[PDB]
Motif scaffolding. Sequence first.
Motif, PDB file in Angstrom:
ATOM      1  N   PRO A   1       0.770  -1.249   0.003  1.00 21.14           N
ATOM      2  CA  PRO A   1       0.041   0.012   0.004  1.00 21.14           C
ATOM      3  C   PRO A   1       0.935   1.390  -0.002  1.00 21.14           C
ATOM      4  N   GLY A   2       0.455   2.167  -0.806  1.00 20.99           N
ATOM      5  CA  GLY A   2       1.215   3.364  -0.689  1.00 20.99           C
ATOM      6  C   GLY A   2       0.376   4.736  -1.454  1.00 20.99           C
ATOM      7  N   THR A   3       0.873   5.767  -1.829  1.00 18.80           N
ATOM      8  CA  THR A   3       0.350   6.857  -2.506  1.00 18.80           C
ATOM      9  C   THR A   3       1.232   7.356  -3.469  1.00 18.80           C
ATOM     10  N   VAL A   4       0.548   8.109  -4.431  1.00 16.58           N
ATOM     11  CA  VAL A   4       1.495   8.819  -5.702  1.00 16.58           C
ATOM     12  C   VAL A   4       2.510   9.528  -4.990  1.00 16.58           C
ATOM     13  N   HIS A   5       2.245  10.675  -3.698  1.00 20.30           N
ATOM     14  CA  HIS A   5       3.087  11.493  -3.509  1.00 20.30           C
ATOM     15  C   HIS A   5       4.216  10.500  -2.802  1.00 20.30           C
ATOM     16  N   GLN A   6       4.020   9.705  -1.865  1.00 24.80           N
ATOM     17  CA  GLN A   6       5.176   8.799  -1.195  1.00 24.80           C
ATOM     18  C   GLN A   6       6.327   8.330  -2.450  1.00 24.80           C
ATOM     19  N   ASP A   7       5.436   7.792  -3.414  1.00 19.44           N
ATOM     20  CA  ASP A   7       6.244   7.004  -4.510  1.00 19.44           C
ATOM     21  C   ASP A   7       7.211   8.185  -5.280  1.00 19.44           C
ATOM     22  N   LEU A   8       6.601   9.155  -5.557  1.00 17.96           N
ATOM     23  CA  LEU A   8       7.512  10.288  -6.165  1.00 17.96           C
ATOM     24  C   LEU A   8       8.638  10.825  -5.286  1.00 17.96           C
ATOM     25  N   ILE A   9       8.190  11.121  -3.821  1.00 21.91           N
ATOM     26  CA  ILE A   9       8.899  11.680  -2.835  1.00 21.91           C
ATOM     27  C   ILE A   9      10.110  10.581  -2.626  1.00 21.91           C
ATOM     28  N   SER A  10       9.897   9.473  -2.953  1.00 25.54           N
ATOM     29  CA  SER A  10      11.055   8.425  -2.746  1.00 25.54           C
ATOM     30  C   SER A  10      11.779   8.194  -3.944  1.00 25.54           C
ATOM     31  N   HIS A  11      11.530   8.843  -5.110  1.00 23.67           N
ATOM     32  CA  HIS A  11      12.456   9.053  -5.942  1.00 23.67           C
ATOM     33  C   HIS A  11      12.977  10.296  -6.259  1.00 23.67           C
ATOM     34  N   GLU A  12      12.750  11.328  -5.268  1.00 22.86           N
ATOM     35  CA  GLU A  12      13.108  12.899  -5.391  1.00 22.86           C
ATOM     36  C   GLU A  12      12.409  13.370  -6.490  1.00 22.86           C
ATOM     37  N   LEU A  13      11.277  12.903  -6.773  1.00 18.51           N
ATOM     38  CA  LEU A  13      10.481  13.528  -7.836  1.00 18.51           C
ATOM     39  C   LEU A  13       9.541  14.726  -7.203  1.00 18.51           C
ATOM     40  N   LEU A  14       9.430  14.531  -5.927  1.00 10.27           N
ATOM     41  CA  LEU A  14       8.783  15.693  -5.104  1.00 10.27           C
ATOM     42  C   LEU A  14       9.834  16.108  -3.885  1.00 10.27           C
ATOM     43  N   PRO A  15       9.814  17.371  -3.656  1.00  6.22           N
ATOM     44  CA  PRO A  15      10.363  17.736  -2.323  1.00  6.22           C
ATOM     45  C   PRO A  15       9.980  17.404  -1.077  1.00  6.22           C
ATOM     46  N   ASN A  16      10.388  17.328   0.324  1.00  2.97           N
ATOM     47  CA  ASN A  16       9.563  17.253   1.583  1.00  2.97           C
ATOM     48  C   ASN A  16       8.361  18.055   1.633  1.00  2.97           C
ATOM     49  N   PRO A  17       7.266  17.392   1.403  1.00  4.91           N
ATOM     50  CA  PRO A  17       5.800  18.302   1.254  1.00  4.91           C
ATOM     51  C   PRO A  17       5.633  19.204   2.445  1.00  4.91           C
ATOM     52  N   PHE A  18       6.042  18.583   3.720  1.00  3.45           N
ATOM     53  CA  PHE A  18       6.013  19.262   4.818  1.00  3.45           C
ATOM     54  C   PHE A  18       6.988  20.070   5.321  1.00  3.45           C
ATOM     55  N   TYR A  19       7.936  20.266   4.550  1.00  2.00           N
ATOM     56  CA  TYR A  19       9.120  21.380   4.772  1.00  2.00           C
ATOM     57  C   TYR A  19       8.887  22.777   4.111  1.00  2.00           C
ATOM     58  N   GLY A  20       9.109  23.721   4.925  1.00  3.95           N
ATOM     59  CA  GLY A  20       9.354  25.181   4.442  1.00  3.95           C
ATOM     60  C   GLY A  20       7.937  25.663   3.640  1.00  3.95           C
ATOM     61  N   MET A  21       8.204  26.240   2.565  1.00  2.00           N
ATOM     62  CA  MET A  21       7.024  26.571   1.680  1.00  2.00           C
ATOM     63  C   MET A  21       6.769  25.681   0.425  1.00  2.00           C
ATOM     64  N   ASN A  22       7.098  24.192   0.793  1.00  4.07           N
ATOM     65  CA  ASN A  22       6.889  23.166  -0.109  1.00  4.07           C
ATOM     66  C   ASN A  22       5.212  22.965  -0.538  1.00  4.07           C
ATOM     67  N   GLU A  23       4.311  23.476   0.281  1.00  4.88           N
ATOM     68  CA  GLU A  23       2.968  22.818   0.014  1.00  4.88           C
ATOM     69  C   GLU A  23       2.599  23.336  -1.480  1.00  4.88           C
ATOM     70  N   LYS A  24       2.778  24.632  -1.924  1.00  3.35           N
ATOM     71  CA  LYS A  24       2.688  25.239  -2.980  1.00  3.35           C
ATOM     72  C   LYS A  24       3.255  24.418  -4.512  1.00  3.35           C
ATOM     73  N   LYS A  25       4.607  23.683  -3.964  1.00  6.80           N
ATOM     74  CA  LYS A  25       4.942  23.238  -5.105  1.00  6.80           C
ATOM     75  C   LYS A  25       4.585  21.448  -5.515  1.00  6.80           C
ATOM     76  N   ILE A  26       3.752  21.161  -4.454  1.00  7.20           N
ATOM     77  CA  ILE A  26       3.618  19.581  -4.696  1.00  7.20           C
ATOM     78  C   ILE A  26       2.092  19.559  -5.237  1.00  7.20           C
ATOM     79  N   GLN A  27       1.585  20.759  -5.393  1.00  7.05           N
ATOM     80  CA  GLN A  27      -0.088  20.676  -6.051  1.00  7.05           C
ATOM     81  C   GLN A  27      -0.043  20.289  -7.234  1.00  7.05           C
ATOM     82  N   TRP A  28       0.962  20.333  -8.179  1.00  8.82           N
ATOM     83  CA  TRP A  28       0.864  19.721  -9.559  1.00  8.82           C
ATOM     84  C   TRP A  28       0.480  18.449  -9.599  1.00  8.82           C
TER      85      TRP A  28
END
Length: 837
Positions: A29-56
């Motif tokens: 079990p897992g999610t699109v976001h985690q799968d992306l995170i685990s290949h560095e295809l998304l930054p850490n969603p919880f860090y900094g101003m990253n919320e805007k950057k994962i909306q795509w």
Amino acid sequence: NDTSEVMLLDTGWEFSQSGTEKWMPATVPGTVHQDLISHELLPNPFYGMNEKKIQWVENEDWEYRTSFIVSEEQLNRDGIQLIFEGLDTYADVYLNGSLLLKADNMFVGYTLPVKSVLRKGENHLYIYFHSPIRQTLPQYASNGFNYPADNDHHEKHLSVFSRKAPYSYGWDWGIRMVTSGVWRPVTLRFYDIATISDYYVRQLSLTDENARLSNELIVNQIVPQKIPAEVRVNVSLNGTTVTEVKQQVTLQPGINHITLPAEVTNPVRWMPNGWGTPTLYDFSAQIACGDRIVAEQSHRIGLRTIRVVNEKDKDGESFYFEVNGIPMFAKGANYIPQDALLPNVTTERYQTLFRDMKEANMNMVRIWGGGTYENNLFYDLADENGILVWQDFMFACTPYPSDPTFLKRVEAEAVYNIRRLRNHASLAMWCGNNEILEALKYWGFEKKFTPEVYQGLMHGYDKLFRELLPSTVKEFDSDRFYVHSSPYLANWGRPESWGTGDSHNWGVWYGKKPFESLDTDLPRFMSQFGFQSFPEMKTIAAFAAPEDYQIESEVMNAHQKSSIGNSLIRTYMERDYIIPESFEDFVYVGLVLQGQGMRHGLEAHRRNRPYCMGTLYWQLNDSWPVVSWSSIDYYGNWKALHYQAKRAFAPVLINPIQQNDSLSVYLISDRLDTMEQMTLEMKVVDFDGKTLGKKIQVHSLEVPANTSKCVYRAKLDGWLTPEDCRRSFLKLILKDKSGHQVAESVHFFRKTKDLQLPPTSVSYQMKQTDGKCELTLFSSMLAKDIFIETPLQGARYSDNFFDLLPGERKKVIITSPRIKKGEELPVNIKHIRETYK
Ligand SMILES: O=[N+]([O-])c1ccc(O[C@@H]2O[C@H](CO)[C@@H](O)[C@H](O)[C@@H]2F)c([N+](=O)[O-])c1
Ligand SMILES: [Br-]
Ligand SMILES: [Br-]
Ligand SMILES: [Br-]
Ligand SMILES: [Br-]
Ligand SMILES: [Br-]
Ligand SMILES: [Br-]
Ligand SMILES: [Cl-]
Ligand SMILES: [Cl-]
Ligand SMILES: [Cl-]
């Protein structure tokens, strides 16, 4: 168990952004976001101003695939089922060329017969996840209005169209991560003859002498013949058979309905936390055909009655829980999802959370309707920890569609999760939604829509929550209480409704009312109330660089989803404390504030029993690093509020309460037994350690079971001088006849900002071994609301955020598997007086 073989499709999965033809490894079990995170295809969603950057991610479609082998013997089994416990959300499921399923409800588990589509050797499973945004844009465009779901953080409020975790679209303590994926396990089961599709252990009656149960089974037979079989139920306790019943049957292809009665004489009751042991029986049902057990299923079962009493009475309409025949004051909190990404929550995190509730002396949790119907593990843990569960259906804070199609989808989730959950001893009641009737009446919505739309929304409210959902409960869980909404009538702005059912008293916070309003503005059951706090700096450091350590920095605002929250916390802080200059000091005093103010509420609610019969604060926990109303931060660090909840919920509490220049003292008990010939002893002590007056003693007091009673009242004038009040505290102890101490409290006669706190120094000795730090703390002078702060995430403390009394040595134990011998755990000890010069 049985002769079936279960194959876990939990490896070998890959995923792709649709349209790209690029495949990468995936975790299910897992999610699109985690799968992306685990290949560095998304930054850490919880860090900094990253919320805007994962909306795509929410605007793309995502595909998942795997392959697996089926042997010749596997292919010859009688039946083969493919089970999806969760698909989030609009997912087309393909197996060997066949469309098995167009899934459209995150909250529904799917069981698919697949024997005729499976192939010898290699088999291919592909799942296409339509974006739940893209999928619902046309739907919204046809709607002709926007539903007023302000927690849906998008111009278009598309959450309401999808049966999908409301909070994933955002919330006022939440990050918007509108994710997709196979969010619960996928299994393949190869079996003979039949499966048990449902096993319901139905309690017909319970007395001290006898438990009368009905074992209801739905058995689905997959073979054409008439099959002689024997149905068997074994009831066992702690490994030893208590009773065993059997029945000869002849099974017909397709669905079969079997009922066996079973009785346990002199049953051992399941009791909630603080009332005794959460005893759990094992019931195993078996379908035997000759020598083979072809299907078995088991449940852990707690024998108990739970009855929600909601009746017109002298005070309005009551709202309380009666457990095994005794009215139980409820103590706990509102629970949210533990992560923006559900499958990231581990078995250990679930386990630790239940430990947190149990150690705070809670006996109830409400699963609030903006999250999910929780997993089997969550309810199993409530079962074995004696925690009652109030289960909202998954509707919150907005009206919803009520068209025939949407209602069919709801009906399938309502039936699926009722049957999944109805055998849990913990399961106490169902609630149609959170705050939706309140929203419709009081939140100024009538002014936002035409009269025709609004009327359609009111009628739409009835079809879902007053018809469909109560009907389903009545049908599938006939002995459990259902209410259409929480709060069902009372509104915090309407004093005249306060005695009618449960209340969300948002007068504190939203209504800006002082904590002392909780002593006067009383509910019949407080189902929510709360107050925000910044989490501690180690959790701040997890999402913000030190350059961003300002209340109003951009990164900090990224983590405060309440737009009035920061000023409101400051407004409340000024009322009780000196607002310090440094950010670190503010956060620390922000913790003390939340804990102290909320606890005063919990106390009031307990003190005011039986008019009030429960209190559940908003909120227990956090889904990510953020400023919120929680008592435990995302990382599992207890805020001051959690320690304060534990104290305020202690089975026996001494509660001093000061109003109109006078002190009463109540003794509050949730013990089932009465205590007799007790002595309340009290003494005033100044900030250096010196007694003032002598010991006040009150003798021969009885503390009756399940009651709150005044045992002492004395005026402050002639009793103590205005100056004394700023320089001393009251120590209270309660001891039995012999003089054994059973409870302790400390009282302050003045608000903390008005105390004449001495500059003092907290010294400690530390003995550190593997996994443990043992501190002994000393201060010759009172040290106010001390915070023992360590950088180690999730570190657990025997106590924290407590007053350290003058000359009274204090032992604190800190544990963490990360603690190692020969590696001084850093300790920083802060206290109120240090926060100003
Ligand atoms: O008066 N209000 O605007 C009000 C009051 C409460 C409320 O929600 C409750 O309070 C909590 C804190 O606001 C929410 O996070 C959660 O939804 C809970 F159900 C919400 N809400 O989430 O829309 C609004
Ligand atoms: Br099959
Ligand atoms: Br099936
Ligand atoms: Br699960
Ligand atoms: Br409208
Ligand atoms: Br109803
Ligand atoms: Br007073
Ligand atoms: Cl956003
Ligand atoms: Cl949830
Ligand atoms: Cl209301």
